[PDB]
Amino acid sequence: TVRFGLLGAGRIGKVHAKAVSGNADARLVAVADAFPAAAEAIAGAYGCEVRTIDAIEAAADIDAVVICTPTDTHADLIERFARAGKAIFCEKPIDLDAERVRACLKVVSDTKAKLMVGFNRRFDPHFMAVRKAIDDGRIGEVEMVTITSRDPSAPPVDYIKRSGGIFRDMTIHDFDMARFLLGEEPVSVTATAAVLIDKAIGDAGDYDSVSVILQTASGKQAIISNSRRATYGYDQRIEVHGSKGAVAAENQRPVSIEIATGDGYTRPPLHDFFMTRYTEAYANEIESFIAAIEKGAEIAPSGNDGLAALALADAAVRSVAEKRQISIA
Amino acid sequence: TVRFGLLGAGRIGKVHAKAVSGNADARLVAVADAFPAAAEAIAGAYGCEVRTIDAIEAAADIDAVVICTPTDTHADLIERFARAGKAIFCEKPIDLDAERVRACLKVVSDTKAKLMVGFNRRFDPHFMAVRKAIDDGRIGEVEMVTITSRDPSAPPVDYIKRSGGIFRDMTIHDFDMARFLLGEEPVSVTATAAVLIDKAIGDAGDYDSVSVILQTASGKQAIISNSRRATYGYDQRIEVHGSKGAVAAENQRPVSIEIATGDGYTRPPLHDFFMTRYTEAYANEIESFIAAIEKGAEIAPSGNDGLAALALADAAVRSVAEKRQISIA
Amino acid sequence: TVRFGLLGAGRIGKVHAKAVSGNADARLVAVADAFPAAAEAIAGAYGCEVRTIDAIEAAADIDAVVICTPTDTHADLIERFARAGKAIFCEKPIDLDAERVRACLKVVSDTKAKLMVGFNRRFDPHFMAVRKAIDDGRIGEVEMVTITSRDPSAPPVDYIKRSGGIFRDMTIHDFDMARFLLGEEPVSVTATAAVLIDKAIGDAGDYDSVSVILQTASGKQAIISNSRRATYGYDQRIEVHGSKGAVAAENQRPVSIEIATGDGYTRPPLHDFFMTRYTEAYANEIESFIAAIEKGAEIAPSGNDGLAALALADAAVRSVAEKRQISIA
Amino acid sequence: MTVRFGLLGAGRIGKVHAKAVSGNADARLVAVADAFPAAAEAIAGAYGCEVRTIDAIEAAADIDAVVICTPTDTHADLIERFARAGKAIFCEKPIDLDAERVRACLKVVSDTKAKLMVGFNRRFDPHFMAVRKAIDDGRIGEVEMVTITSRDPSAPPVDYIKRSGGIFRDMTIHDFDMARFLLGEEPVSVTATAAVLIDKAIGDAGDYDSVSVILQTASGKQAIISNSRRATYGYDQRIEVHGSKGAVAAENQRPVSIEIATGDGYTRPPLHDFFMTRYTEAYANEIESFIAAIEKGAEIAPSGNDGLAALALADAAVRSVAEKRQISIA
Ligand code: NA
Ligand code: NA
């Protein structure tokens, strides 16, 4: 069985701890975090040791690591763990700077490391079923993709300043989803953006409401709509229109009931955020990773996928600034 | 009693006739049409006269006209009937050339004439309830609009050649819808396009699958998605995300049943023909005209709504060709 | 051209007058009612005559009659017009007393008259589609039928006293629906009942909340649920489970929008009034009556359908009182 | 503290509880038993617990609680034995098919102050719980009329049918419990109909496969229940409650929710095959509630009396079909 070390014991870390513990072929061996209480919290809940990042790098009883530390640490930590011969799962992003990313990937290649990036949406049972429908020919040739993502609320200002901006922090999942759904590469990005929700996000130099169109060489188009706040919860919809039809995945909620009164028919709001919306996705993610470890199996999403997504995000940022379509090729 | 002349005895003409005839405050006095069998059938159906356009224009027993003739006759007809002192309902568009439309409206302004343009979707009960919800404060401030429209099949190449292209012929309804749903004027347009469905359309100098982002001065965004072909029928969706919540209108189908087997739960496809989808909007549209004549209120959608829609289409054509964001004057 | 007399100028009469007039194969010739002004308002609108019932019965220029007068006149009027050789459409029921109904139908049979009873739900587009799915074999052999009907508001006591009680007045439509969906005769009825909504209904000797199970000789079962009051509107559902799958018809509302907030996703309530739900069914029913006259066609729903549905109501009453399953002779 | 569990029975239902016990943070699966050692071994293999005998689990100091997933004819005796041995007991439905036997069993459970929860897992489903909570919160006013539809993907085999006590005792039993859960009051009368519409071999075995039931309470509230042994579209599990101020319903669940639209229509996937995947959250919540009962001493629901009450409704349904009349509940 595959022995895991977890780095980062915050929201994202907890979600991965659960997934690892839930997986029958995986053992969660140690946790590390800057805040010791935060690693202890997970150590208790799951019965694993607390350790330093250094110690996990050094330990021969760690086959793989899961990196859920802050954004600034990622590229460094991947390189370190690839040097030490660990299989690596790293949460988005590899880095905010595309050149730093390329450097980090050279190391992975040179060390022959297994790296999976965290685009968890590719492992959602619902979104997977959309992709399998496309693969089975149910909608013919893909033509037009529509992706709408709305977070329940914006992060605080401090996270925004470090985050790399909405396109890189939020829209990046959707850029990856567009690549996942289209079946081929976007070669052009045009984007609009505004600050409609909270001035303070503008003051920090970010946007909170963005719209994007990507186009491939064959003309297929993907439209992305993003908003940092929705009162009804975590909006996560995909839709693909094709020559033979369309396929969509509806929004998920934790509980599905309906109450009818003179005021109408009411169903509950959506999941608060990724923690509960993507529980099954996290389990499928870890399982894929394990298959990619214990067998020599194709890793996806790869380091190449994290870069391509950032490339689109960078190209969107510029599109907004230069008020025009930005080539990628 | 409002005395009507009808110019155009085709499919739409037949509908508007039905509406006018059955309205208690209006009478269909005469019909004019280049197809003499078509004008005769309507005359027989509603016991009114067949007249030439000239006779209807010069007649003293006609208070208003419904213009359902081909697009290239619209501007000229509007000017003539304004000068003759009739009130005018014209089917979209006024003309295809912005410059021509401007000159037409100068004539409507100077004659002080009543002109409604046929943007029927403003009169759809479902879309009207969406706008009403926004008016009632139910979603707070409008932030992001998404509009999806897909026809059940492409037009024939002869129709395409005199249509003025997808942005002017199809998307024009969505541009108006966007203005209807946004609080505000769009001041920028950006667009992508392709020929995904039938190369005969690309040859004829047109696109069949287009995407459009519009932004207002306050930064509000509307996204428009159009496809000329959808095997599942006539797809007409609007959604508006706001600060307090979101509102949307659902697709319509002629019967609401569901059959469940080992293959799944299946509901029928949507309407296979636009006129069946919009039977109520066409009725409300004329009813509203006839009512706005009598009390003599100011009219929407108006000539300028006709122009603004077209200019937005014009900017979309440029935006694709110039691969950049185009500003509205 | 089928020439009609309308007997009864209340709200139902007005709707039926519309249907007859608008039909290319029918003319509304005369209208009777106990209140002169009611009859005059209809006749005047359709440019036809006010006549006495006696005159319509004697008249050689009347081919068919629509009966919309009070229930206690139906059996007598049907007999009269059957003897007079007119085709007959009668609003339910023939009479509240099954022996009286049997007498009426013997006269109908000896005179070889044509009689349709107004079980308008058989002509609803949605319920017809369900029945067509069954006829086409899409659910295999019918096994289990579930019918739910709930009114928006309970009727006033004076309505109740002349209604024959909930089973004869309300459930009667569901009993006919059951026969229509089962495609074979129920032979047993088991029912329960209560006064849950308004004690005044119980004080008048009636119930407001009832449950019924019908079973056929082959063992197929239909369950019926009825409530006199639902704050969410006029609930009318049918479901049929069969050997290969199941089929259901969904509730109808005036507009199809949805608002999402932190309180959840809310669709509007159902129609608040029954005639608004059944617009098309009333139109189809009359259309189909007129086509059956033009042809020499077999008229359904027939007098016998009227009797069969009442016999089920009578058995339900007795089942409630005697706490047992009642066999239908 | 950690609750130490012995599992008795390693079939389908046993596997589902193994998973739920395993998945719970406060519990450890220590021992499995089964009459077929391969089946037990398989569960021991996959979870790293021991294969013991039932006698051993009974005598074991290192067992706090048992989950009884053995055949139905062993339930009442096993409950009495583990009650006397001081284990907390979770028992899959039924306690017994015979109400007098159930009564004798509950007397032993009461005399030994044993903790017994019976397996009406539907009460722990997040969707059904939220229906009940909405009713508790007053969102539909006073309950008036309940409608429950349950349809299995396909019928069990004849050998199972013959030892099952028949469709009312074996299938509808869950819906009788659900009706009591939703109504808030006891049914006092049962009237039912039945037939063999699906497979004549069920009828030849003395059972029915398609049944309809109406329950009524003293205040007049009514519950209609519809059951079919076979639905091509999967495991149909719906509840609906009409009240004075509105209605509340839980829709069916399916494993994947997508929609494909073509000229043929808009198609969503079929439902869950069976209880194994439909009720995974419910089985977690149930074990969680059982542990809470063990840890805090809270009174248990679904209790022994709830198992008895559902069986008494089933017995009344059987009589109602045979006698063609409404049967009152003692
Ligand atoms: Na006529
Ligand atoms: Na555990």
Tab-separated table of N, CA and C and ligand atoms in Angstrom, chain D residues 21-25 27-28, ligand 2:
chain	number	residue	atom	x	y	z
D	21	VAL	N	-19.239	1.002	9.438
D	21	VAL	CA	-18.540	0.922	10.723
D	21	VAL	C	-17.110	1.364	10.516
D	22	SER	N	-16.495	0.815	9.471
D	22	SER	CA	-15.138	1.180	9.089
D	22	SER	C	-15.013	2.689	8.913
D	23	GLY	N	-15.950	3.274	8.167
D	23	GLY	CA	-15.897	4.685	7.815
D	23	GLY	C	-16.062	5.615	8.998
D	24	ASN	N	-16.648	5.122	10.082
D	24	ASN	CA	-16.890	5.965	11.238
D	24	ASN	C	-15.626	6.110	12.104
D	25	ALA	N	-15.433	7.329	12.602
D	25	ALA	CA	-14.234	7.713	13.313
D	25	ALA	C	-14.215	7.138	14.719
D	27	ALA	N	-15.433	4.278	15.782
D	27	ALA	CA	-15.720	2.843	15.812
D	27	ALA	C	-14.629	2.047	15.162
D	28	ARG	N	-14.438	0.816	15.632
D	28	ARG	CA	-13.504	-0.120	15.010
D	28	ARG	C	-14.182	-1.458	14.785
E	2	NA	NA	-13.650	3.048	11.925
